[PDB]
Design an enzyme around this catalytic site. Structure first.
Site, PDB file in Angstrom:
ATOM      1  N   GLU A  27      -3.375  -5.557  10.627  1.00  0.00           N
ATOM      2  CA  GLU A  27      -3.574  -4.350  11.438  1.00  0.00           C
ATOM      3  C   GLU A  27      -4.939  -3.700  11.181  1.00  0.00           C
ATOM      4  O   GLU A  27      -5.485  -3.033  12.066  1.00  0.00           O
ATOM      5  CB  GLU A  27      -2.445  -3.349  11.128  1.00  0.00           C
ATOM      6  CG  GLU A  27      -2.530  -1.987  11.822  1.00  0.00           C
ATOM      7  CD  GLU A  27      -2.093  -2.022  13.283  1.00  0.00           C
ATOM      8  OE1 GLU A  27      -1.744  -3.114  13.803  1.00  0.00           O
ATOM      9  OE2 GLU A  27      -2.098  -0.942  13.918  1.00  0.00           O
ATOM     10  N   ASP A  31      -3.473  -3.979  -0.176  1.00  0.00           N
ATOM     11  CA  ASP A  31      -3.342  -2.918  -1.158  1.00  0.00           C
ATOM     12  C   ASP A  31      -2.658  -3.468  -2.382  1.00  0.00           C
ATOM     13  O   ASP A  31      -1.766  -4.279  -2.262  1.00  0.00           O
ATOM     14  CB  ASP A  31      -2.467  -1.763  -0.621  1.00  0.00           C
ATOM     15  CG  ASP A  31      -3.261  -0.713   0.178  1.00  0.00           C
ATOM     16  OD1 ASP A  31      -4.302  -1.042   0.788  1.00  0.00           O
ATOM     17  OD2 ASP A  31      -2.820   0.458   0.199  1.00  0.00           O
ATOM     18  N   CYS A  56      -3.387   6.399  -5.011  1.00  0.00           N
ATOM     19  CA  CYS A  56      -2.428   7.185  -4.245  1.00  0.00           C
ATOM     20  C   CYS A  56      -0.996   6.931  -4.693  1.00  0.00           C
ATOM     21  O   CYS A  56      -0.687   5.875  -5.229  1.00  0.00           O
ATOM     22  CB  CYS A  56      -2.594   6.851  -2.774  1.00  0.00           C
ATOM     23  SG  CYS A  56      -4.215   7.307  -2.095  1.00  0.00           S
ATOM     24  N   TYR A  73      -7.956  12.926   2.344  1.00  0.00           N
ATOM     25  CA  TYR A  73      -7.086  13.283   1.220  1.00  0.00           C
ATOM     26  C   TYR A  73      -7.553  14.582   0.578  1.00  0.00           C
ATOM     27  O   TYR A  73      -8.535  14.580  -0.189  1.00  0.00           O
ATOM     28  CB  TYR A  73      -7.104  12.194   0.142  1.00  0.00           C
ATOM     29  CG  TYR A  73      -6.719  10.800   0.579  1.00  0.00           C
ATOM     30  CD1 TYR A  73      -5.630  10.575   1.424  1.00  0.00           C
ATOM     31  CD2 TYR A  73      -7.423   9.694   0.103  1.00  0.00           C
ATOM     32  CE1 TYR A  73      -5.272   9.281   1.808  1.00  0.00           C
ATOM     33  CE2 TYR A  73      -7.075   8.396   0.473  1.00  0.00           C
ATOM     34  CZ  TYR A  73      -5.997   8.194   1.321  1.00  0.00           C
ATOM     35  OH  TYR A  73      -5.648   6.904   1.685  1.00  0.00           O
ATOM     36  N   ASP A  78      -2.860  16.507 -10.914  1.00  0.00           N
ATOM     37  CA  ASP A  78      -2.718  16.008 -12.271  1.00  0.00           C
ATOM     38  C   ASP A  78      -1.444  16.640 -12.817  1.00  0.00           C
ATOM     39  O   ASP A  78      -1.122  17.778 -12.456  1.00  0.00           O
ATOM     40  CB  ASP A  78      -3.848  16.516 -13.160  1.00  0.00           C
ATOM     41  CG  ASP A  78      -5.146  15.750 -12.985  1.00  0.00           C
ATOM     42  OD1 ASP A  78      -5.126  14.597 -12.504  1.00  0.00           O
ATOM     43  OD2 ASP A  78      -6.198  16.299 -13.371  1.00  0.00           O
ATOM     44  N   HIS A 114      -6.447  13.898 -10.011  1.00  0.00           N
ATOM     45  CA  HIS A 114      -7.028  12.560  -9.933  1.00  0.00           C
ATOM     46  C   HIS A 114      -6.129  11.511  -9.279  1.00  0.00           C
ATOM     47  O   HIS A 114      -6.442  10.310  -9.257  1.00  0.00           O
ATOM     48  CB  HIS A 114      -7.474  12.124 -11.332  1.00  0.00           C
ATOM     49  CG  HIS A 114      -8.482  13.047 -11.939  1.00  0.00           C
ATOM     50  ND1 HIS A 114      -8.126  14.198 -12.612  1.00  0.00           N
ATOM     51  CD2 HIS A 114      -9.836  13.016 -11.934  1.00  0.00           C
ATOM     52  CE1 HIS A 114      -9.219  14.828 -13.007  1.00  0.00           C
ATOM     53  NE2 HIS A 114     -10.268  14.121 -12.623  1.00  0.00           N
ATOM     54  N   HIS A 131       1.165   0.749   4.549  1.00  0.00           N
ATOM     55  CA  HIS A 131       1.192   0.546   3.096  1.00  0.00           C
ATOM     56  C   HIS A 131       1.945   1.643   2.346  1.00  0.00           C
ATOM     57  O   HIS A 131       2.624   1.372   1.351  1.00  0.00           O
ATOM     58  CB  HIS A 131      -0.248   0.488   2.560  1.00  0.00           C
ATOM     59  CG  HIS A 131      -0.923  -0.822   2.807  1.00  0.00           C
ATOM     60  ND1 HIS A 131      -2.037  -0.948   3.609  1.00  0.00           N
ATOM     61  CD2 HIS A 131      -0.642  -2.067   2.350  1.00  0.00           C
ATOM     62  CE1 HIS A 131      -2.409  -2.217   3.650  1.00  0.00           C
ATOM     63  NE2 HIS A 131      -1.584  -2.915   2.889  1.00  0.00           N
ATOM     64  N   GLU A 152      -6.434   0.583  -2.062  1.00  0.00           N
ATOM     65  CA  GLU A 152      -7.021  -0.461  -1.250  1.00  0.00           C
ATOM     66  C   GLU A 152      -7.879  -1.264  -2.191  1.00  0.00           C
ATOM     67  O   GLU A 152      -8.678  -0.694  -2.948  1.00  0.00           O
ATOM     68  CB  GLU A 152      -7.956   0.079  -0.182  1.00  0.00           C
ATOM     69  CG  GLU A 152      -7.418   1.058   0.810  1.00  0.00           C
ATOM     70  CD  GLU A 152      -8.533   1.525   1.761  1.00  0.00           C
ATOM     71  OE1 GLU A 152      -9.599   0.828   1.824  1.00  0.00           O
ATOM     72  OE2 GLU A 152      -8.347   2.577   2.439  1.00  0.00           O
TER      73      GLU A 152
END
Ligand SMILES: [Zn+2]
Ligand SMILES: [Zn+2]
Length: 191
Positions: A27, A31, A56, A73, A78, A114, A131, A152
């Site tokens: 597509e 990942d 992520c 994003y 954290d 993070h 994903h 990724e």
């Protein structure tokens, strides 16, 4: 040539054993994916090595509601407690495990951070073939909390070529290589 893909059953067994897998969607793209609760300094370090950028944490909708991560994003987090600055493999692994903990709430975390939490669509890859959904699906299929960790993989020239390079890379590190298409088909027949 047609590059070998692993069975979804092997991908699920890897996830359950606390290992990573690689998921392609036909597509875009591969990942690296593991279950967030299975995060260790070593596995995060491995992911960091091959990430294009962000790490992520796809999360089930019910987790997101509990954390106040509404469908509305830029959100990074954290763990509030028990870490250094938040950037080490060990810190990110802690943060990821906390996100998978069924009792975590917003104030167990700090912003900014993070790790990037992501909301998976209810129904997973059957609903949205991403994903994000695959990661949650794989964790849940493995009998774990419905929470994954994804990145990724650094790519960049050709379609057929990407898959073959991913197959070698997978094999050098003992990872399963699957497509979202095969995950959809498996789920549809085994649910
Ligand atoms: Zn993707
Ligand atoms: Zn390795």
């Amino acid at each position: 040539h047609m590059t070998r893909l692993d069975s979804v059953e092997r991908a699920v067994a890897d996830i359950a054993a606390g290992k990573a897998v690689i998921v392609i969607d036909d597509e875009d793209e591969g990942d690296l994916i593991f279950a967030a609760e299975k995060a260790t300094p070593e596995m995060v370090a491995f992911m960091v090595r091959y990430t294009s950028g962000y790490l992520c944490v796809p999360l089930d909708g019910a987790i997101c509601d509990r954390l106040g991560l509404l469908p509305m994003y830029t959100v990074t987090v954290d763990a509030r407690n028990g870490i250094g600055t938040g950037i080490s493999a060990s810190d990110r692994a802690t943060t990821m495990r906390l996100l998978a903990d069924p009792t975590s709430v917003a104030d167990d975390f700090t912003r900014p951070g993070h790790v990037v939490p992501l909301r998976a669509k209810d129904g997973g890859v059957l609903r949205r073939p991403g994903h994000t959904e695959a990661a949650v699906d794989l964790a849940r299929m493995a009998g774990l909390q419905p929470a994954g960790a994804i990145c990724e993989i650094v790519s960049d020239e050709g379609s057929m070529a990407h898959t073959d390079e991913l197959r070698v890379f997978a094999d050098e590190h003992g990872l399963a290589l699957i497509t979202i298409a095969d995950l959809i088909e498996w789920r549809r027949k085994h649910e």
